[PDB]
């Protein structure tokens, strides 16, 4: 037996594992994918390539007993056991925290008096898991969907592996339409989200002292730049009552809906225009096919105006008296 192929393969595997444990800097530098990623997002140069690699590495300590059932749906043959002290697990949390803070703050700045539920929804939209995954995909953080054996056969260096995202992905997970339902740890989207968070965390770490706001700026460029129409987030129960309550709370005369213009009464499709007056100051215009509908619309409009108020930067930070409660 001139060639012990099992031995060579084993050696290769060991080497790969070692690299993962280390994430040597030289190896990271050699990786093209990582380099490309770095250039793409215009990351600060203090951020090393090892760090980047780490960010793409999700915590995979011990292979589950779910592997032993490929006959029962799942098989995990792509990943290699990660170092416990060198995963993205810590970074990820930090990133998440940052996202929670900063995005929320931004939203508040944009829209004081935004009903808490609505605010929460907005936040979710900005930084939900799915959205984060999408962002990651866009960036180009690809997943390691190639078995270690396959890689060995190909004869690709470890640099490529480092460049790819690494977690316990179920090879053979959606074949013949069968999907093994597992925890959050084994989903691709979640992994992507984590990676995204980790990148942010890394950035923060590098630029905590030289330029504290850099991270925030980056986030704004990437996360806060995304369009979300806040008007599309609301849904009112009986808004008239709420409006009245609001008026009572503030120094306003009781609101009254009044007919401003009307056309096509006695028809399939009429148009009624009703304003909700508070003395003289019109508080909400509302159109409708019926009178009732129009009234409702007016109320809704008023509520929207009250809530989605967006004050300028030259103003002194406005703080609302919470949400109206009835």
């Amino acid at each position: 037996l001139p060639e012990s192929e099992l031995a060579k393969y084993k050696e290769y595997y060991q080497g790969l594992k070692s690299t993962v444990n280390e994430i040597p800097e030289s190896v990271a530098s050699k990786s093209p994918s990582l380099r490309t990623l770095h250039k793409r997002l215009q990351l600060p140069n203090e951020l090393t390539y090892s760090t980047l690699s780490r960010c793409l590495t999700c915590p995979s300590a011990k292979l589950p007993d779910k592997i032993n059932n490929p006959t029962k749906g799942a098989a995990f043959v792509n990943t290699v056991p990660t170092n416990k002290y060198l995963d993205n697990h810590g970074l990820n949390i930090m990133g998440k925290n940052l996202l929670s803070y900063h995005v929320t703050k931004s939203i508040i700045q944009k829209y004081p008096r935004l009903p808490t539920v609505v605010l929460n929804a907005a936040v979710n939209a900005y930084i939900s898991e799915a959205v984060l995954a999408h962002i990651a995909k866009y960036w180009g953080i690809e997943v390691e969907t190639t078995s270690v054996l396959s890689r060995y056969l190909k004869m690709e260096p470890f640099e490529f592996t480092l460049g790819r995202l690494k977690f316990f992905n179920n090879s053979l997970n959606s074949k013949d339409g069968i999907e093994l339902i597992t925890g959050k740890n084994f989903s691709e989207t979640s992994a992507l989200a984590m990676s995204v968070r980790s990148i942010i965390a890394a950035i923060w770490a590098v630029t905590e002292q030289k330029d504290s706001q850099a991270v925030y700026r980056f986030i704004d460029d990437h996360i806060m730049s995304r369009k979300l129409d806040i008007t599309k987030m609301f849904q009112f129960e009986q808004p008239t009552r709420e409006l009245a309550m609001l008026c009572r709370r503030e120094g306003l005369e009781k609101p009254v809906s009044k007919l401003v213009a009307e056309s096509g009464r006695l028809s399939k499709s009429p148009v009624f225009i009703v304003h909700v007056f508070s003395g003289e100051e019109t508080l909400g215009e509302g159109y409708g096919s019926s009178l009732k509908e129009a009234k409702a619309r007016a109320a809704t409009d008023a509520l929207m105006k009250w809530y989605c108020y967006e004050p300028l930067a030259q103003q002194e930070p406005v703080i609302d008296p919470g949400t109206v409660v009835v």
Binding site: P32, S33, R35, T36, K39, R40, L41, Q42, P115, V117, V118, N120, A121, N124, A125, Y126, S128, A130, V131, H134, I135, K137, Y138, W139, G140, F218, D220, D221, H222, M224, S225, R226, K227, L228, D229, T231, K232, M233, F234, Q235, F236, E237, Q238, E242, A261, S263, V271, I273, Y287, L303, Y307, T323, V326
Partner: protein, 138 residues
């Protein structure tokens, strides 16, 4: 009461930062095959190196396969253009590559007359109303 109905944010590539649309380009060629001569020449000629130097945010794979020569390119949105550069010469190949790089991945599509802008922002001014017109009709 106020209830929130869920939604998600839409990405606008250029408003904050700008992610570069093209990510990977795979120069595919063959040692044997006259159709792949220009491609081979291009690969040889330091032009590739120059390109790499120019555009470091995009990675250049270099495969060896038995068929015609290709330039498969992979974009942010996910889509993949693929140009077979059968029988082209160096300069033409380079031009093709340039074209690939320039494009965003998006699919080709017929535009109508004067359909220029594409917004997802509600009109600054309102949508016209007959009742809120400055001039009434008759």
């Amino acid at each position: 009461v106020v209830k929130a109905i869920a939604r998600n944010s839409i990405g606008r590539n250029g408003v904050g930062a700008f992610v570069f649309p093209c990510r990977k380009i795979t120069l595919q060629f063959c040692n044997w095959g006259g159709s792949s001569e220009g491609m081979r020449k291009f690969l040889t000629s330091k032009r590739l190196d120059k390109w790499g130097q120019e555009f470091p945010w995009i990675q250049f794979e270099v495969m060896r396969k038995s068929g015609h020569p290709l330039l498969r390119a992979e974009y942010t949105n996910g889509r993949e253009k693929v140009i077979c550069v059968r029988n082209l010469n160096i300069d033409n190949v380079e031009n093709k590559l340039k074209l690939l790089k320039d494009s965003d991945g998006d699919i080709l599509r017929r535009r109508t007359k004067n359909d220029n802008v594409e917004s997802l922002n509600s009109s600054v001014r309102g949508i016209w109303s007959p009742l809120h017109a400055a001039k009434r009709h008759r």
